[PDB]
Amino acid sequence: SGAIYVGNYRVVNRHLATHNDWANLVWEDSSRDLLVSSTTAQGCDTIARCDCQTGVYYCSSRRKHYPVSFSKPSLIFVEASEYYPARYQSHLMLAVGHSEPGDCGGILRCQHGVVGIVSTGGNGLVGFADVRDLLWLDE
Ligand SMILES: NC(=O)[C@H]1CCCN(C(=O)Cc2ncc3ccc(Br)cn23)C1
Ligand SMILES: [Zn+2]
């Protein structure tokens, strides 16, 4: 679990969005596993606007942060789950690092700010949904 709080927005994994997120929907994209909802309070986070390919993510299943090298956002095949049919997830970045079911929502950050959130993984890999291209989050 986990979310990004920037301005009057809350960014969460679309498959983990609550009834309240859907009632305050701003934008959602099943192909990216992202959903953005509006908030009444001002958020605590800053979004990176860069092309960094190294950073640090939070891994809830270890209660620890790990440094990673990740691939640029791209279209990657994701096998069927209880949440989605088998499909290509877009804007996804992969890294070698631990992750297990329950780790979605952990933040990935570089020196410029928030880069993305954990969205898939397995077998010693971790996949992150990028948010750096969502320029409208800053207004
Ligand atoms: N983005 C998606 O389609 C995910 C939706 C929830 C379901 N998806 C998964 O990957 C579930 C899953 N099985 C093994 C692992 C290991 C690490 C992580 Br993080 C998640 N994991 C796929
Ligand atoms: Zn950066």
Side-chain angles (χ1 to χ4, degrees), residues 46-50 109-115 130-133:
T46 278
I47 309 294
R49 303 296 180 199
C50 64
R109 279 175 166 270
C110 62
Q111 61 188 104
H112 308 108
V114 170
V115 169
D130 186 50
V131 299
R132 298 172 285 188
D133 64 316

Side-chain angles (χ1 to χ4, degrees), residues 1 5 7 10 16-17 24 26 29 43 53 55 77 88 125 128-130:
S1 66
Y5 294 93
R10 167 175 137 103
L16 299 179
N24 294 280
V26 169
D29 186 333
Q53 288 185 242
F77 187 70
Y88 286 84
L125 295 169
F128 312 95
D130 186 50

Side-chain angles (χ1 to χ4, degrees), residues 14-15 29-30 33-34 79-87 89:
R14 191 190 184 272
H15 73 278
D29 186 333
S30 175
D33 183 40
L34 289 179
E79 196 183 349
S81 72
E82 48 199 282
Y83 305 105
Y84 299 108
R87 78 205 212 283
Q89 174 160 323

Side-chain angles (χ1 to χ4, degrees), residues 6-44:
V6 53
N8 291 283
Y9 296 125
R10 167 175 137 103
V11 188
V12 290
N13 291 95
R14 191 190 184 272
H15 73 278
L16 299 179
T18 67
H19 299 306
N20 282 321
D21 285 321
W22 279 102
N24 294 280
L25 180 61
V26 169
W27 167 87
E28 51 77 29
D29 186 333
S30 175
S31 78
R32 296 180 64 152
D33 183 40
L34 289 179
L35 180 148
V36 177
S37 60
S38 62
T39 70
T40 53
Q42 216 70 28
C44 58

Side-chain angles (χ1 to χ4, degrees), residues 106-124:
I107 283 176
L108 171 61
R109 279 175 166 270
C110 62
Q111 61 188 104
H112 308 108
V114 170
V115 169
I117 50 172
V118 173
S119 173
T120 191
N123 305 304

